[PDB]
Amino acid sequence: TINYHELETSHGRIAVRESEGEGAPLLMIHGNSSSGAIFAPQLEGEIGKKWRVIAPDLPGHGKSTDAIDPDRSYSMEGYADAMTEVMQQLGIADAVVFGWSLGGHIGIEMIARYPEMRGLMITGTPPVAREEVGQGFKSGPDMALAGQEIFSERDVESYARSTCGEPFEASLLDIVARTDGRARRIMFEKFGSGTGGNQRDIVAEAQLPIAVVNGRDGPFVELDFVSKVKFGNLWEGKTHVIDNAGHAPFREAPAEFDAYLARFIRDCTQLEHHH
Ligand SMILES: CCCCCC(=O)N[C@@H](CCO)C(=O)O
């Protein structure tokens, strides 16, 4: 049973899905033009059965309302503010955070705002300074869509297929089509204007465990670049790659992805802590 409910926040009304797991909490943050519903395999599977999985919809996405103030909310740092507010309302200060793509960038911004975070896993996310975008991401037509306000029906399909990968389901179109397109345009411009913290520096200096897990065949992330990024505390000492998966290994290869996520949560929450 997934517990769905909505929170009135300063950013607007935020939809939240929670599993019924009694264990330590895991915040899962979805990507650009997605929603927390994308994390069905974790919410409804072994991860969500054990751990308290929380999968909200960002402002402008899914079942959340559009942002009260797009100029405040639609940016990596603005979304980080919104998710921090959500966690405060839920009374949870020490979640492990999993961020998918845009969600991973948001998670990086959350490090400063959510100091008791027990770990951060990023998938589909190259930590990059603004000038490093070409190094961290692969060039292509779906990539251009990341910052494009208006999607035709065909842009909806191309974007959904490239970002969500196999298997494609019609329900994915509904999610992408709903997205407030202003959020794409504004977030992308602000990323390029360096309005938030330098993500390269943030992850280099961050002391909490950061896990990096990607599909080998994703169309967006430069995996070699990611494997060279400096992290303060890289979980298991390397970046991890799942064969036969693209941008969304949590749905494309759930068992393999869940092995990493479960082990990371265990490591971050159930080992004796020494500074
Ligand atoms: C080039 C800037 C990318 C910003 C983050 C983003 O939109 N990530 C997408 C993946 C890239 O299309 C996602 O959340 O899936």
Author numbering: 2 to 276
Which sentences did the original study use to describe this structure?
We also solved the crystal structure of AidHE219G–C6-HS at 1.11 Å resolution. Surprisingly, the mutant AidHE219G is not completely inactive and the activity of AidHY160G is significantly decreased. Although the conformational change of His248 reduces the hydrolytic efficiency, AidHE219G is not completely inactive. The biochemical data demonstrate that the Glu219→Gly mutation weakens the His-dependent solvent-assisted deprotonation and thus decreases the activity of AidH. Moreover, the hydroxyl group in the structure of AidHE219G–C6-HS flips to the opposite side compared with that in AidH–C4-­HS and forms a hydrogen bond to Met144 instead of Tyr160. Two possible conformations of the newly formed hydroxyl group are found.
N-Acyl homoserine lactonases (AHL-lactonases) have important functions in decreasing pathogenicity by degrading AHLs.
